[PDB]
């Protein structure tokens, strides 16, 4: 007999963290979600109402609706050869703000600050990010660091 229920295979996914069972810290209920916010989804096993399906555990999406105890999040799911827009109603216990916003929103500010400062100095500044480049030339001092010669060691048994 095959089994394919709603929470099948979620034995470990929906577990609480080790030594983290029990009551919910109240910053979870004090966070404020607005339409357009990017949120990570992680089901809390101790709250069974407004719980996401196992597909959405670990997914990140956009808030589109705010209700009494829940937010509506838009997820794009692959169905065959295209994406389908999914609208999931989730209580805020299974939701956390996505930390990817705060890095990009700070880089926007830093670019704006750098641009005005170069503009203030009447010079130019380059704001595009760069991948790591190969390192330049350099000189290695040997005072206290004369090269030590190594050799491969013979085989030994230590049991």
């Amino acid at each position: 007999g095959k089994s394919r229920g709603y929470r099948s295979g979620t034995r470990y996914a929906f577990q609480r963290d080790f030594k983290k069972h029990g009551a919910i810290p109240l910053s979870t209920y004090l966070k404020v979600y607005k339409v357009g916010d990017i949120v990570d989804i992680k089901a809390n096993g101790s709250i069974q109402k407004g719980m996401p399906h196992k597909y959405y555990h670990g997914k990140t999406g956009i808030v589109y609706n705010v209700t009494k105890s829940s937010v509506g999040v838009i997820i794009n799911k692959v169905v065959g050869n295209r994406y389908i827009e999914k609208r999931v109603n989730l209580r805020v216990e299974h939701v956390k703000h996505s930390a990817c916003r705060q890095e990009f929103l700070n880089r926007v500010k830093s670019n704006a600050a750098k641009k005005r400062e170069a503009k203030a100095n009447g010079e130019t500044v380059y704001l595009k990010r760069q991948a790591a480049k190969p390192r330049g030339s350099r000189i290695i001092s040997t005072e206290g660091n004369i090269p030590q010669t190594l050799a491969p060691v013979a085989y030994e048994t230590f049991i």
Partner: protein
């Protein structure tokens, strides 16, 4: 396969210039079992561009037989000559991207003298794939 397509290497013995960073290095690492690459000298770049240098003009492969073609396509990037293009390639310049994408992928012949006994193993293990570095010049000398 996608990585080789994005490098414009869609046939055997096709050559391309890549500016070494992290993104492109991880790209070449993915394509490593299928390519031979290395560090080209100035004479190798000159010979490649002179004999097999072609430009992408209106999505067509046009021989670089006159400096007017290069000027008409790269003058907004301060490239006015075949030597300007070679210089921009060799000492990796601010417009390496535009100059290398304007350059059609080099279509080289097979080596005069052959490969090693078995190609599809790393250059370190006696094969041909991976980084051979200054020996890319000998390989290009064999194939161009």
């Amino acid at each position: 396969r996608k990585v080789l397509q994005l490098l414009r290497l869609t046939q055997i013995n096709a050559g391309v210039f890549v500016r070494l960073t992290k993104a492109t290095s991880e790209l070449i690492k993915l394509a490593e079992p299928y390519v031979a690459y290395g560090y080209p000298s100035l004479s190798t770049i000159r010979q490649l561009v002179y004999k097999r240098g072609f430009g992408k003009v209106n999505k067509q492969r046009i021989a670089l037989s006159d400096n007017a073609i290069i000027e008409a396509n790269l003058g907004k990037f301060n490239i006015l000559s075949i030597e300007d293009l070679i210089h921009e390639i060799y000492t990796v310049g601010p417009n390496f991207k535009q100059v290398s994408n304007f350059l059609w992928p080099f279509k080289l012949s097979n080596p005069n003298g052959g490969f090693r006994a078995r190609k599809f193993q790393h250059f370190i293990q006696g094969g041909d794939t991976g980084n051979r570095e200054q020996f890319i010049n000998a390989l290009v000398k064999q194939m161009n």
